PDB file of C-alpha atoms in Angstrom:
ATOM      1  CA  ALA A   1     -70.140 -46.195   4.780  1.00 49.19           C
ATOM      2  CA  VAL A   2     -72.947 -43.639   5.160  1.00 48.42           C
ATOM      3  CA  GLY A   3     -75.680 -42.173   2.977  1.00 47.74           C
ATOM      4  CA  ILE A   4     -76.617 -44.470   0.108  1.00 49.08           C
ATOM      5  CA  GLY A   5     -73.976 -46.841   1.511  1.00 47.81           C
ATOM      6  CA  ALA A   6     -75.461 -47.138   5.014  1.00 47.65           C
ATOM      7  CA  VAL A   7     -76.153 -50.645   6.297  1.00 47.34           C
ATOM      8  CA  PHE A   8     -78.946 -51.681   8.650  1.00 49.17           C
TER       9      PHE A   8
ATOM     10  CA  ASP B   1     -63.856 -33.768   7.090  1.00 50.84           C
ATOM     11  CA  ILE B   2     -62.748 -35.579   3.926  1.00 49.39           C
ATOM     12  CA  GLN B   3     -61.526 -33.206   1.218  1.00 48.28           C
ATOM     13  CA  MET B   4     -62.156 -34.107  -2.446  1.00 47.51           C
ATOM     14  CA  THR B   5     -59.896 -32.666  -5.150  1.00 46.53           C
ATOM     15  CA  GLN B   6     -60.877 -33.061  -8.813  1.00 51.07           C
ATOM     16  CA  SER B   7     -58.629 -32.716 -11.857  1.00 51.24           C
ATOM     17  CA  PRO B   8     -58.752 -31.096 -14.313  1.00 52.05           C
ATOM     18  CA  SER B   9     -61.084 -28.210 -13.513  1.00 49.36           C
ATOM     19  CA  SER B  10     -61.972 -27.869 -17.213  1.00 50.40           C
ATOM     20  CA  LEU B  11     -61.422 -29.800 -20.424  1.00 51.18           C
ATOM     21  CA  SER B  12     -62.527 -29.782 -24.037  1.00 50.02           C
ATOM     22  CA  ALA B  13     -62.352 -32.714 -26.432  1.00 52.20           C
ATOM     23  CA  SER B  14     -63.839 -33.794 -29.721  1.00 52.28           C
ATOM     24  CA  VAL B  15     -66.812 -36.116 -30.089  1.00 51.89           C
ATOM     25  CA  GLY B  16     -65.577 -39.686 -29.843  1.00 51.40           C
ATOM     26  CA  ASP B  17     -62.563 -38.864 -27.693  1.00 53.65           C
ATOM     27  CA  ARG B  18     -61.748 -40.751 -24.544  1.00 54.24           C
ATOM     28  CA  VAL B  19     -61.552 -38.396 -21.570  1.00 57.12           C
ATOM     29  CA  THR B  20     -60.517 -39.089 -17.978  1.00 56.79           C
ATOM     30  CA  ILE B  21     -61.303 -37.116 -14.800  1.00 57.23           C
ATOM     31  CA  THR B  22     -59.565 -37.863 -11.507  1.00 56.33           C
ATOM     32  CA  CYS B  23     -60.651 -37.385  -7.904  1.00 55.74           C
ATOM     33  CA  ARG B  24     -58.273 -37.600  -4.936  1.00 52.92           C
ATOM     34  CA  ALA B  25     -59.596 -37.869  -1.395  1.00 51.91           C
ATOM     35  CA  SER B  26     -57.673 -36.570   1.606  1.00 52.50           C
ATOM     36  CA  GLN B  27     -57.900 -40.102   3.092  1.00 53.87           C
ATOM     37  CA  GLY B  28     -58.919 -43.583   1.965  1.00 56.20           C
ATOM     38  CA  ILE B  29     -62.644 -43.909   1.285  1.00 55.14           C
ATOM     39  CA  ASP B  30     -62.818 -47.652   0.547  1.00 54.34           C
ATOM     40  CA  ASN B  31     -64.553 -47.281  -2.840  1.00 55.80           C
ATOM     41  CA  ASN B  32     -67.451 -45.335  -1.260  1.00 58.81           C
ATOM     42  CA  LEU B  33     -67.569 -42.906  -4.161  1.00 58.27           C
ATOM     43  CA  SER B  34     -70.190 -41.675  -6.605  1.00 59.19           C
ATOM     44  CA  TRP B  35     -69.971 -39.752  -9.850  1.00 61.79           C
ATOM     45  CA  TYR B  36     -72.680 -37.217 -10.769  1.00 60.51           C
ATOM     46  CA  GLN B  37     -73.322 -35.313 -13.998  1.00 58.95           C
ATOM     47  CA  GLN B  38     -74.953 -31.864 -14.052  1.00 58.30           C
ATOM     48  CA  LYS B  39     -76.163 -30.726 -17.456  1.00 60.39           C
ATOM     49  CA  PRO B  40     -76.783 -27.013 -18.066  1.00 56.92           C
ATOM     50  CA  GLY B  41     -79.923 -25.812 -16.301  1.00 56.62           C
ATOM     51  CA  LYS B  42     -80.568 -29.172 -14.613  1.00 54.25           C
ATOM     52  CA  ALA B  43     -80.147 -30.896 -11.273  1.00 56.68           C
ATOM     53  CA  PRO B  44     -77.237 -33.351 -10.966  1.00 55.87           C
ATOM     54  CA  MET B  45     -77.939 -36.984 -11.823  1.00 56.05           C
ATOM     55  CA  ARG B  46     -75.826 -39.893 -10.610  1.00 58.17           C
ATOM     56  CA  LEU B  47     -73.751 -41.837 -13.115  1.00 57.41           C
ATOM     57  CA  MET B  48     -72.390 -44.439 -10.735  1.00 59.08           C
ATOM     58  CA  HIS B  49     -71.831 -45.453  -7.114  1.00 59.71           C
ATOM     59  CA  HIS B  50     -69.283 -47.661  -5.311  1.00 60.90           C
ATOM     60  CA  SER B  51     -66.852 -45.909  -7.721  1.00 63.04           C
ATOM     61  CA  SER B  52     -67.673 -48.222 -10.634  1.00 62.66           C
ATOM     62  CA  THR B  53     -71.288 -49.486 -10.434  1.00 61.70           C
ATOM     63  CA  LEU B  54     -73.340 -47.772 -13.145  1.00 61.68           C
ATOM     64  CA  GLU B  55     -76.921 -46.725 -12.476  1.00 60.39           C
ATOM     65  CA  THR B  56     -79.823 -48.071 -14.507  1.00 62.98           C
ATOM     66  CA  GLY B  57     -79.925 -46.491 -17.951  1.00 64.35           C
ATOM     67  CA  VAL B  58     -76.463 -44.909 -17.762  1.00 69.05           C
ATOM     68  CA  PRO B  59     -74.694 -45.407 -21.123  1.00 67.26           C
ATOM     69  CA  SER B  60     -71.832 -47.896 -21.119  1.00 68.39           C
ATOM     70  CA  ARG B  61     -69.357 -45.228 -22.321  1.00 70.00           C
ATOM     71  CA  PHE B  62     -69.142 -44.141 -18.653  1.00 74.31           C
ATOM     72  CA  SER B  63     -66.864 -46.179 -16.401  1.00 76.99           C
ATOM     73  CA  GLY B  64     -65.205 -45.768 -13.003  1.00 73.42           C
ATOM     74  CA  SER B  65     -61.997 -47.071 -11.476  1.00 72.01           C
ATOM     75  CA  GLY B  66     -59.634 -46.545  -8.564  1.00 71.24           C
ATOM     76  CA  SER B  67     -59.144 -47.474  -4.935  1.00 68.83           C
ATOM     77  CA  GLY B  68     -58.064 -46.034  -1.603  1.00 68.48           C
ATOM     78  CA  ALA B  69     -58.015 -42.269  -2.079  1.00 70.00           C
ATOM     79  CA  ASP B  70     -57.529 -42.166  -5.888  1.00 71.61           C
ATOM     80  CA  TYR B  71     -60.384 -42.587  -8.367  1.00 70.64           C
ATOM     81  CA  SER B  72     -61.140 -41.848 -12.008  1.00 70.38           C
ATOM     82  CA  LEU B  73     -64.168 -41.419 -14.266  1.00 68.96           C
ATOM     83  CA  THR B  74     -63.641 -42.276 -17.935  1.00 71.17           C
ATOM     84  CA  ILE B  75     -65.902 -41.308 -20.820  1.00 71.60           C
ATOM     85  CA  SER B  76     -65.015 -43.702 -23.657  1.00 72.03           C
ATOM     86  CA  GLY B  77     -66.343 -41.865 -26.685  1.00 74.53           C
ATOM     87  CA  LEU B  78     -67.584 -38.419 -25.726  1.00 75.56           C
ATOM     88  CA  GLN B  79     -71.008 -37.547 -27.159  1.00 71.78           C
ATOM     89  CA  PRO B  80     -72.411 -34.085 -27.993  1.00 71.46           C
ATOM     90  CA  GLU B  81     -74.931 -34.363 -25.139  1.00 68.98           C
ATOM     91  CA  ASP B  82     -72.130 -34.955 -22.602  1.00 68.17           C
ATOM     92  CA  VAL B  83     -71.634 -31.192 -22.090  1.00 70.36           C
ATOM     93  CA  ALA B  84     -71.815 -30.900 -18.318  1.00 71.58           C
ATOM     94  CA  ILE B  85     -70.071 -30.436 -14.986  1.00 69.92           C
ATOM     95  CA  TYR B  86     -69.000 -33.741 -13.401  1.00 72.35           C
ATOM     96  CA  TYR B  87     -68.640 -34.192  -9.635  1.00 72.86           C
ATOM     97  CA  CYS B  88     -67.207 -36.907  -7.427  1.00 72.76           C
ATOM     98  CA  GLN B  89     -68.745 -37.517  -3.999  1.00 75.12           C
ATOM     99  CA  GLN B  90     -67.532 -39.496  -0.999  1.00 76.13           C
ATOM    100  CA  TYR B  91     -69.948 -41.245   1.374  1.00 78.55           C
ATOM    101  CA  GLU B  92     -67.356 -42.948   3.560  1.00 79.52           C
ATOM    102  CA  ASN B  93     -68.056 -40.498   6.405  1.00 80.80           C
ATOM    103  CA  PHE B  94     -70.346 -37.661   7.348  1.00 78.87           C
ATOM    104  CA  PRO B  95     -70.453 -34.941   6.274  1.00 75.17           C
ATOM    105  CA  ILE B  96     -70.948 -35.922   2.650  1.00 72.38           C
ATOM    106  CA  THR B  97     -68.472 -33.989   0.521  1.00 72.84           C
ATOM    107  CA  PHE B  98     -68.170 -33.375  -3.233  1.00 71.58           C
ATOM    108  CA  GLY B  99     -65.313 -32.565  -5.534  1.00 73.08           C
ATOM    109  CA  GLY B 100     -65.110 -29.075  -6.972  1.00 74.31           C
ATOM    110  CA  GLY B 101     -66.327 -30.219 -10.376  1.00 77.12           C
ATOM    111  CA  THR B 102     -64.920 -30.694 -13.861  1.00 75.31           C
ATOM    112  CA  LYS B 103     -66.499 -28.762 -16.724  1.00 70.20           C
ATOM    113  CA  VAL B 104     -66.627 -30.723 -19.993  1.00 68.14           C
ATOM    114  CA  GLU B 105     -67.032 -28.915 -23.314  1.00 67.46           C
ATOM    115  CA  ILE B 106     -67.086 -30.339 -26.844  1.00 69.85           C
ATOM    116  CA  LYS B 107     -64.658 -29.405 -29.591  1.00 73.59           C
ATOM    117  CA  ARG B 108     -66.354 -29.246 -32.985  1.00 74.51           C
ATOM    118  CA  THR B 109     -65.901 -27.669 -36.399  1.00 75.24           C
ATOM    119  CA  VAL B 110     -65.836 -23.893 -36.726  1.00 73.41           C
ATOM    120  CA  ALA B 111     -69.269 -22.329 -37.219  1.00 70.69           C
ATOM    121  CA  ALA B 112     -69.685 -18.665 -38.101  1.00 67.10           C
ATOM    122  CA  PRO B 113     -72.167 -16.628 -36.040  1.00 69.02           C
ATOM    123  CA  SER B 114     -75.352 -15.238 -37.506  1.00 70.55           C
ATOM    124  CA  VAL B 115     -75.308 -11.554 -36.561  1.00 71.92           C
ATOM    125  CA  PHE B 116     -78.376  -9.452 -35.735  1.00 72.33           C
ATOM    126  CA  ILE B 117     -78.806  -5.923 -34.396  1.00 73.91           C
ATOM    127  CA  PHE B 118     -81.828  -4.737 -32.402  1.00 72.04           C
ATOM    128  CA  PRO B 119     -82.601  -1.040 -32.114  1.00 72.69           C
ATOM    129  CA  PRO B 120     -84.338   0.010 -28.888  1.00 71.96           C
ATOM    130  CA  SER B 121     -88.090   0.338 -28.904  1.00 70.82           C
ATOM    131  CA  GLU B 122     -89.443   3.783 -28.146  1.00 72.02           C
ATOM    132  CA  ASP B 123     -90.908   2.550 -24.871  1.00 71.68           C
ATOM    133  CA  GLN B 124     -87.219   2.196 -24.043  1.00 71.59           C
ATOM    134  CA  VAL B 125     -86.700   5.680 -25.445  1.00 68.32           C
ATOM    135  CA  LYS B 126     -89.422   7.013 -23.137  1.00 68.86           C
ATOM    136  CA  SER B 127     -87.814   5.226 -20.160  1.00 67.17           C
ATOM    137  CA  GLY B 128     -84.653   7.368 -19.724  1.00 64.86           C
ATOM    138  CA  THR B 129     -82.175   4.615 -20.684  1.00 65.63           C
ATOM    139  CA  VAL B 130     -81.704   2.832 -24.024  1.00 63.53           C
ATOM    140  CA  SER B 131     -80.200  -0.577 -24.844  1.00 64.34           C
ATOM    141  CA  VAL B 132     -79.017  -1.596 -28.327  1.00 60.49           C
ATOM    142  CA  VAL B 133     -78.605  -5.372 -28.646  1.00 61.56           C
ATOM    143  CA  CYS B 134     -76.244  -7.235 -30.978  1.00 60.64           C
ATOM    144  CA  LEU B 135     -76.748 -11.017 -31.137  1.00 64.31           C
ATOM    145  CA  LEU B 136     -74.186 -13.565 -32.370  1.00 62.32           C
ATOM    146  CA  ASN B 137     -76.122 -16.791 -32.866  1.00 63.56           C
ATOM    147  CA  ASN B 138     -74.939 -20.412 -32.954  1.00 65.61           C
ATOM    148  CA  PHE B 139     -71.180 -20.129 -33.414  1.00 67.01           C
ATOM    149  CA  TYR B 140     -68.043 -22.081 -32.512  1.00 66.47           C
ATOM    150  CA  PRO B 141     -65.515 -21.538 -31.097  1.00 68.05           C
ATOM    151  CA  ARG B 142     -66.578 -19.377 -28.133  1.00 69.91           C
ATOM    152  CA  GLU B 143     -64.019 -16.653 -28.868  1.00 67.85           C
ATOM    153  CA  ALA B 144     -65.419 -13.695 -30.801  1.00 68.51           C
ATOM    154  CA  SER B 145     -64.880  -9.940 -31.078  1.00 65.88           C
ATOM    155  CA  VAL B 146     -67.720  -7.386 -31.042  1.00 63.16           C
ATOM    156  CA  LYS B 147     -67.125  -3.696 -31.711  1.00 65.79           C
ATOM    157  CA  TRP B 148     -69.773  -1.013 -31.260  1.00 65.37           C
ATOM    158  CA  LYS B 149     -69.909   1.902 -33.706  1.00 66.88           C
ATOM    159  CA  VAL B 150     -71.776   5.157 -33.276  1.00 65.34           C
ATOM    160  CA  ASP B 151     -71.770   7.270 -36.434  1.00 63.87           C
ATOM    161  CA  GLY B 152     -68.432   5.582 -37.198  1.00 63.31           C
ATOM    162  CA  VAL B 153     -66.688   6.170 -33.830  1.00 65.13           C
ATOM    163  CA  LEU B 154     -65.975   3.284 -31.483  1.00 63.50           C
ATOM    164  CA  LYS B 155     -68.005   3.085 -28.276  1.00 61.00           C
ATOM    165  CA  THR B 156     -66.812   0.259 -26.056  1.00 61.30           C
ATOM    166  CA  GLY B 157     -67.040   1.769 -22.574  1.00 61.13           C
ATOM    167  CA  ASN B 158     -70.770   1.090 -22.066  1.00 57.88           C
ATOM    168  CA  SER B 159     -71.248  -2.372 -23.535  1.00 56.19           C
ATOM    169  CA  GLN B 160     -71.584  -5.723 -21.785  1.00 56.08           C
ATOM    170  CA  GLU B 161     -71.586  -9.295 -23.044  1.00 55.10           C
ATOM    171  CA  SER B 162     -73.317 -12.517 -22.029  1.00 55.16           C
ATOM    172  CA  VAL B 163     -72.703 -16.011 -23.422  1.00 55.05           C
ATOM    173  CA  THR B 164     -74.888 -19.094 -23.235  1.00 54.69           C
ATOM    174  CA  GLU B 165     -73.631 -22.445 -22.065  1.00 54.32           C
ATOM    175  CA  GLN B 166     -72.627 -24.827 -24.821  1.00 54.81           C
ATOM    176  CA  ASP B 167     -75.647 -26.285 -26.626  1.00 53.25           C
ATOM    177  CA  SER B 168     -76.208 -29.978 -25.942  1.00 48.13           C
ATOM    178  CA  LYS B 169     -77.196 -30.856 -29.536  1.00 48.00           C
ATOM    179  CA  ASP B 170     -75.103 -28.731 -31.927  1.00 46.47           C
ATOM    180  CA  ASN B 171     -72.376 -27.776 -29.406  1.00 46.41           C
ATOM    181  CA  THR B 172     -72.463 -24.088 -30.366  1.00 45.73           C
ATOM    182  CA  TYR B 173     -72.596 -20.898 -28.328  1.00 47.10           C
ATOM    183  CA  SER B 174     -74.641 -17.709 -28.595  1.00 45.41           C
ATOM    184  CA  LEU B 175     -73.629 -14.272 -27.357  1.00 44.98           C
ATOM    185  CA  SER B 176     -75.304 -10.933 -26.670  1.00 47.74           C
ATOM    186  CA  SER B 177     -73.533  -7.579 -26.602  1.00 51.48           C
ATOM    187  CA  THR B 178     -75.673  -4.798 -25.157  1.00 51.63           C
ATOM    188  CA  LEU B 179     -74.769  -1.109 -25.499  1.00 54.25           C
ATOM    189  CA  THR B 180     -76.400   1.074 -22.829  1.00 53.89           C
ATOM    190  CA  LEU B 181     -76.778   4.832 -23.275  1.00 53.64           C
ATOM    191  CA  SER B 182     -78.930   7.702 -22.123  1.00 56.74           C
ATOM    192  CA  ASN B 183     -81.829   8.743 -24.339  1.00 57.07           C
ATOM    193  CA  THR B 184     -80.326  12.147 -25.027  1.00 54.96           C
ATOM    194  CA  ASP B 185     -76.992  10.575 -25.997  1.00 54.37           C
ATOM    195  CA  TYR B 186     -78.788   7.950 -28.118  1.00 53.78           C
ATOM    196  CA  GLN B 187     -80.935  10.483 -29.985  1.00 57.29           C
ATOM    197  CA  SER B 188     -77.900  12.734 -30.594  1.00 58.65           C
ATOM    198  CA  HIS B 189     -76.446  10.078 -32.933  1.00 64.00           C
ATOM    199  CA  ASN B 190     -77.675   8.713 -36.136  1.00 61.91           C
ATOM    200  CA  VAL B 191     -76.557   5.240 -37.269  1.00 61.67           C
ATOM    201  CA  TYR B 192     -75.623   2.387 -34.898  1.00 61.22           C
ATOM    202  CA  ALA B 193     -73.641  -0.674 -35.950  1.00 58.29           C
ATOM    203  CA  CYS B 194     -72.053  -3.746 -34.417  1.00 61.37           C
ATOM    204  CA  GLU B 195     -69.000  -5.284 -36.102  1.00 62.81           C
ATOM    205  CA  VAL B 196     -68.150  -8.934 -35.487  1.00 64.46           C
ATOM    206  CA  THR B 197     -64.913 -10.772 -36.145  1.00 63.24           C
ATOM    207  CA  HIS B 198     -64.722 -14.545 -35.680  1.00 63.96           C
ATOM    208  CA  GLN B 199     -62.707 -17.458 -37.029  1.00 66.71           C
ATOM    209  CA  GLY B 200     -65.665 -18.532 -39.174  1.00 67.58           C
ATOM    210  CA  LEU B 201     -65.964 -15.168 -40.951  1.00 68.65           C
ATOM    211  CA  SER B 202     -63.827 -14.484 -44.016  1.00 67.94           C
ATOM    212  CA  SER B 203     -64.352 -10.748 -43.494  1.00 70.02           C
ATOM    213  CA  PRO B 204     -65.763  -8.909 -40.470  1.00 70.21           C
ATOM    214  CA  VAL B 205     -69.565  -8.683 -40.506  1.00 68.68           C
ATOM    215  CA  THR B 206     -71.188  -5.380 -39.605  1.00 69.30           C
ATOM    216  CA  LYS B 207     -74.918  -4.936 -38.938  1.00 69.73           C
ATOM    217  CA  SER B 208     -76.355  -1.455 -38.852  1.00 71.60           C
ATOM    218  CA  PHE B 209     -79.471   0.646 -38.460  1.00 71.14           C
ATOM    219  CA  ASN B 210     -80.565   4.261 -38.959  1.00 72.99           C
ATOM    220  CA  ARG B 211     -82.152   6.020 -35.988  1.00 68.49           C
ATOM    221  CA  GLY B 212     -85.535   7.379 -37.064  1.00 70.11           C
TER     222      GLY B 212
END
């Protein structure tokens, strides 16, 4: 996922 | 990119109804979906993310479901303040993409418009162009008929109408009809009237004024 769903 | 298709494009339902909006993605988005609400005049605000996880302070009447490429937003008990455009959004991939939106309007009881007529000020008269304004205030449903009358003859070529968005508290509409004429044409006629027919009116209502 990207945006608010990005994972670091 | 990922295409988002929302259905229906518009809907109207009474307060307390259960309404459902669907969003289909062109490919599976693995529940990476948000629902946003945009009230009239305002920026969108998010109702939920991950297709079903409500944001803090979002009323429990809002719920989300679905999987893969098919998702739905349900309003369980529509409220008067729910007048808005609702959008889905995918964040599975860049670019972020939104659905085309679903406009939600409230059905309510018939309310007759209050009718007013506004003669042009004489600043307007000095200007070269004159505008006569007829206002239909706080009515439901949206559909109404406005006729312009100039010394008893109908003048509908040079009028234009504008309608507000549905009010978020009383769920009514307001409407302006503006008749535009030259000063010489305006001062060559004597009495101006607007005649309004609407479901809430037992008989047509006409409002009038005498020039000079």
